[PDB]
Design a protein around this motif. Structure first.
Motif, short mmCIF file in Angstrom:
data_model
loop_
_atom_site.label_atom_id
_atom_site.label_comp_id
_atom_site.label_asym_id
_atom_site.label_seq_id
_atom_site.Cartn_x
_atom_site.Cartn_y
_atom_site.Cartn_z
N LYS A 95 23.76 47.26 88.24
CA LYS A 95 23.65 48.44 87.35
C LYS A 95 22.26 48.60 86.78
CE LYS A 95 25.41 50.38 83.03
NZ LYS A 95 26.61 50.47 82.17
N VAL A 96 21.80 49.84 86.74
CA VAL A 96 20.59 50.20 86.02
C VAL A 96 21.01 50.85 84.70
CG1 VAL A 96 18.44 51.48 86.05
CG2 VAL A 96 19.29 50.46 88.14
N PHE A 97 20.66 50.21 83.60
CA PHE A 97 20.95 50.70 82.26
C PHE A 97 19.99 51.82 81.87
CE2 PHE A 97 23.45 46.94 81.72
CZ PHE A 97 24.28 47.20 80.67
N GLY A 98 20.47 52.68 80.98
CA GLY A 98 19.58 53.51 80.20
C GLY A 98 19.03 52.75 79.00
N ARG A 99 17.89 53.24 78.51
CA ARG A 99 17.23 52.57 77.39
C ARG A 99 18.16 52.43 76.19
NH1 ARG A 99 14.22 54.59 73.23
NH2 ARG A 99 14.37 56.71 74.09
N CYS A 100 18.69 53.56 75.69
CA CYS A 100 19.55 53.49 74.52
C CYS A 100 20.90 52.87 74.85
CB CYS A 100 19.76 54.88 73.92
SG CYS A 100 18.28 55.58 73.17
N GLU A 101 21.36 53.03 76.09
CA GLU A 101 22.57 52.33 76.51
C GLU A 101 22.40 50.82 76.37
OE1 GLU A 101 23.57 52.67 80.62
OE2 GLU A 101 25.66 52.05 80.30
N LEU A 102 21.29 50.28 76.88
CA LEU A 102 21.04 48.85 76.74
C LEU A 102 20.87 48.45 75.28
CD1 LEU A 102 20.68 46.13 78.06
CD2 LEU A 102 18.22 46.61 78.29
N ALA A 103 20.20 49.29 74.48
CA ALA A 103 20.04 48.97 73.07
C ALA A 103 21.40 48.77 72.40
CB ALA A 103 19.25 50.07 72.38
N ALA A 104 22.36 49.64 72.68
CA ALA A 104 23.67 49.54 72.05
C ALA A 104 24.41 48.28 72.50
CB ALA A 104 24.50 50.78 72.34
N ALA A 105 24.30 47.93 73.78
CA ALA A 105 24.94 46.71 74.25
C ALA A 105 24.25 45.49 73.68
CB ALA A 105 24.96 46.67 75.78
N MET A 106 22.92 45.49 73.67
CA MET A 106 22.18 44.38 73.07
C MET A 106 22.58 44.21 71.61
SD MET A 106 18.42 44.78 74.99
CE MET A 106 17.97 43.60 76.25
N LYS A 107 22.65 45.32 70.88
CA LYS A 107 23.07 45.27 69.48
C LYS A 107 24.51 44.78 69.33
CE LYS A 107 23.10 48.11 65.35
NZ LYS A 107 22.74 49.41 64.73
N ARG A 108 25.43 45.39 70.08
CA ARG A 108 26.82 44.93 70.06
C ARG A 108 26.88 43.44 70.30
NH1 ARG A 108 29.56 45.29 75.85
NH2 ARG A 108 31.03 43.56 75.60
N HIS A 109 26.18 42.97 71.34
CA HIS A 109 26.14 41.57 71.69
C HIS A 109 25.34 40.73 70.70
CE1 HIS A 109 27.31 42.93 75.88
NE2 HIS A 109 28.10 41.90 75.67
N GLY A 110 24.88 41.32 69.59
CA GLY A 110 24.29 40.54 68.53
C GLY A 110 22.84 40.15 68.73
N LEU A 111 22.06 40.95 69.46
CA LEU A 111 20.65 40.63 69.66
C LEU A 111 19.72 41.27 68.64
CD1 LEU A 111 20.13 40.52 73.50
CD2 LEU A 111 20.13 38.62 71.86
N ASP A 112 20.05 42.44 68.09
CA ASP A 112 19.21 43.03 67.05
C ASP A 112 19.03 42.01 65.93
OD1 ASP A 112 17.64 44.78 65.55
OD2 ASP A 112 19.29 46.04 64.87
N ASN A 113 17.80 41.54 65.75
CA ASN A 113 17.42 40.57 64.73
C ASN A 113 17.90 39.16 65.04
OD1 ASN A 113 15.94 42.45 63.21
ND2 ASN A 113 17.75 43.04 62.01
N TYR A 114 18.23 38.86 66.29
CA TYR A 114 18.59 37.49 66.64
C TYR A 114 17.35 36.61 66.60
CZ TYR A 114 21.32 33.71 68.58
OH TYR A 114 21.97 32.51 68.77
N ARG A 115 17.45 35.48 65.90
CA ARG A 115 16.31 34.63 65.58
C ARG A 115 15.12 35.44 65.08
NH1 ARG A 115 19.51 30.54 64.66
NH2 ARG A 115 20.56 29.84 66.59
N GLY A 116 15.40 36.52 64.36
CA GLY A 116 14.37 37.33 63.74
C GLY A 116 13.72 38.35 64.64
N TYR A 117 14.13 38.45 65.91
CA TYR A 117 13.55 39.38 66.86
C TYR A 117 14.33 40.69 66.85
CZ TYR A 117 10.82 35.47 68.61
OH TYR A 117 9.94 34.43 68.74
N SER A 118 13.70 41.76 66.37
CA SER A 118 14.32 43.07 66.29
C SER A 118 14.60 43.63 67.69
CB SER A 118 13.42 44.02 65.49
OG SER A 118 12.16 44.17 66.10
N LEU A 119 15.16 44.85 67.73
CA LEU A 119 15.77 45.35 68.96
C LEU A 119 14.74 45.93 69.93
CD1 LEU A 119 18.69 45.43 70.04
CD2 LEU A 119 18.82 47.79 69.19
#
Ligand SMILES: [Cl-]
Ligand code: NA
Length: 129
Positions: free
Chosen positions: A1-25
């Motif tokens: 699969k090729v993700f869209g930019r905002c599509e990947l952002a939402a999955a990354m966020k859902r999966h808990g990556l936004d601000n994981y170990r202090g690294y924003s999205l």
């Protein structure tokens, strides 16, 4: 699969990556453009002979076993193939372990060289928040 930019952002966020170990999205989204051009299937050899897999390009020497890399540690207990799916979960569980390995996002050469020291909010600009 090729993700869209905002599509990947939402999955990354859902999966808990936004601000994981202090690294924003925008960081993670930025790491994923340049490692893989947003493609869960991308695979690239490394000189050392290892291969990098998937949407962040998780490397077989430590991180997943591909059966052709001498000394593989398979520190995510996983087959490298499974990181090429359309279900980014195994990549994001393993990426959380890598980033936590002390050098942070430096573990990603493309992040260092191309994301780091930039306004990495352009990478989510236009995304529903
Ligand atoms: Cl850090
Ligand atoms: Na390994």
């Amino acid at each position: 699969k090729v993700f869209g930019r905002c599509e990947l952002a939402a999955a990354m966020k859902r999966h808990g990556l936004d601000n994981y170990r202090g690294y924003s999205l925008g960081n993670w989204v930025c790491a994923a453009k340049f490692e893989s051009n947003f493609n869960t299937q991308a695979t690239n050899r490394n000189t050392d002979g290892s291969t990098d897999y998937g949407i962040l390009q998780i490397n077989s020497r430590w991180w997943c076993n591909d059966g052709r890399t001498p000394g593989s540690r398979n520190l995510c207990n996983i087959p490298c193939s499974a990181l090429l799916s359309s279900d980014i979960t195994a990549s994001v569980n393993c990426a959380k372990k890598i980033v936590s390995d002390g050098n942070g996002m430096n573990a990603w050469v493309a992040w260092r060289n191309r994301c780091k020291g930039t306004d990495v909010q352009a990478w989510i600009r236009g995304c529903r928040l």
